[PDB]
Amino acid sequence: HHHHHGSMKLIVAVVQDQDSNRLLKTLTDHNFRVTKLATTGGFLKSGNTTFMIGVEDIRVNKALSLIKENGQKRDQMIAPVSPMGGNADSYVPYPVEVEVGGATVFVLPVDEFHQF
Amino acid sequence: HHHHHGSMKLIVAVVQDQDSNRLLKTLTDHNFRVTKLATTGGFLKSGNTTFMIGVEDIRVNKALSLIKENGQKRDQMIAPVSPMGGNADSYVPYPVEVEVGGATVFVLPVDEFHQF
Amino acid sequence: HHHHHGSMKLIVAVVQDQDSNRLLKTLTDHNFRVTKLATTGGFLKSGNTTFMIGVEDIRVNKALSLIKENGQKRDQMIAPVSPMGGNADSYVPYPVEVEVGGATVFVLPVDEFHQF
Ligand SMILES: Nc1ncnc2c1ncn2[C@@H]1O[C@@H]2COP(=O)(O)O[C@H]3[C@@H](O)[C@H](n4cnc5c(N)ncnc54)O[C@@H]3COP(=O)(O)O[C@H]2[C@H]1O
Numbered sequence: 001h002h003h004h005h006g007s008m009k010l011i012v013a014v015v016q017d018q019d020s021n022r023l024l025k026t027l028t029d030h031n032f033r034v035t036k037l038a039t040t041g042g043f044l045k046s047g048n049t050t051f052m053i054g055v056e057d058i059r060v061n062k063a064l065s066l067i068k069e070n071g072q073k074r075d076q077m078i079a080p081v082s083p084m085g086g087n088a089d090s091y092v093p094y095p096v097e098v099e100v101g102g103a104t105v106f107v108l109p110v111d112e113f114h115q116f
Numbered sequence: 117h118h119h120h121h122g123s124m125k126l127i128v129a130v131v132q133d134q135d136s137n138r139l140l141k142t143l144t145d146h147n148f149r150v151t152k153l154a155t156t157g158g159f160l161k162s163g164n165t166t167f168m169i170g171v172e173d174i175r176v177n178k179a180l181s182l183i184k185e186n187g188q189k190r191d192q193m194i195a196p197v198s199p200m201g202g203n204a205d206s207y208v209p210y211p212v213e214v215e216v217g218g219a220t221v222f223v224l225p226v227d228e229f230h231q232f
Numbered sequence: 233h234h235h236h237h238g239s240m241k242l243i244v245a246v247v248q249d250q251d252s253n254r255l256l257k258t259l260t261d262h263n264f265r266v267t268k269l270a271t272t273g274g275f276l277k278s279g280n281t282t283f284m285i286g287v288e289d290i291r292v293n294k295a296l297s298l299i300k301e302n303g304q305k306r307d308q309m310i311a312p313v314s315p316m317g318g319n320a321d322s323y324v325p326y327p328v329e330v331e332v333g334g335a336t337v338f339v340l341p342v343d344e345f346h347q348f
Pocket residue numbers: 014015040041042043044045046048098099100101102103104259260261262263264265266267268284285286287
């Protein structure tokens with residue numbers, strides 16, 4: 001049998017808080033419609049921002065190019081086991097550092113789009 | 117080659133806070149299952165509510181009709197540049213007004229649905 | 233006409249807060265990448281946790297098996313009408329109890345995946 005999807009895509013982009021306001025302004029200035037979700041990174045257990053951007057298929061590439069050009073790689077660290085916290089500040093000799101990328105982006109197919 | 121999707125759909129509906137409790141009650145009263153996300157509108161930079169509703173394909177239209185009948189258009193304004201806020205109250209001669217719709221809704225295909 | 237989707241899937245898993253930290257540790261220990269959303273159950277009107285896990289199709293089953301083995305069924309109750317709250321504590325003779333499952337999981341197709 002046979003199926004298709006609609007003309008809209010749903011972009012889900014996880015970005016760093018430090019890059020969020022910058023991205024949001026660029027997107028809405030370019031007439032993109034955005035919903036923002038306050039999220040937490042699973043590895044760093046720290047706040048980040050997820051943007052949900054429903055876009056016509058013909059504008060997906062422009063949205064992606066704005067997201068790509070917006071962000072910056074940053075180094076962050078995993079928070080040590082915190083029962084003693086007043087010394088964990090003092091510690092970590094070999095910080096578990098990770099590089100956080102500008103954006104992790106999913107472009108999802110959409111069966112139906114409605115504005116009610 | 118050939119693929120299909122499952123019988124479930126994932127409805128993602130962005131609604132106004134003022135209409136949220138009303139919608140939620142209607143949905144769960146009609147045996148729909150709902151997860152609520154506290155979100156922010158990208159343009160107004162204000163709180164709104166996103167409902168995630170996983171629905172059998174055969175009940176999608178009923179869910180959509182409840183969402184459609186629930187909401188109301190409302191006017192809102194963009195908050196002016198706030199460094200001086202004590203006068204921004206005083207200002208805005210030509211308020212940038214927008215009309216917020218009852219619901220923006222995405223119906224997503226789902227490859228697998230599991231209840232563990 | 234003809235379409236396909238990409239090799240990535242987006243897993244959306246709604247779990248209980250009591251099982252969240254346990255699941256997160258297991259997932260990231262197994263090299264899965266996770267974004268966490270603080271959500272609310274529509275029926276219980278209480279906090280729960282939604283994990284968004286973008287996974288290569290070839291690792292989906294492993295992710296699902298970790299999610300499945302992680303959770304536990306728990307009983308919860310619907311909060312009574314609260315205008316008098318100081319007696320609603322006193323009340324509810326026939327508590328509306330529900331069984332909350334370990335995880336409700338959607339595996340979504342993904343058209344494009346980008347790391348910028
Ligand atoms: N299990 C693991 N083992 C070793 N290293 C790990 C790891 N999980 C994450 N990392 C590393 O830690 C950085 C921050 O991850 P976090 O989970 O806090 O924050 C993530 C998460 O919120 C989200 N993310 C990335 N990939 C994802 C995916 N496939 N599915 C869901 N969320 C993803 O984007 C944020 C930034 O990710 P990015 O890859 O740029 O950067 C990641 C990566 O460098």
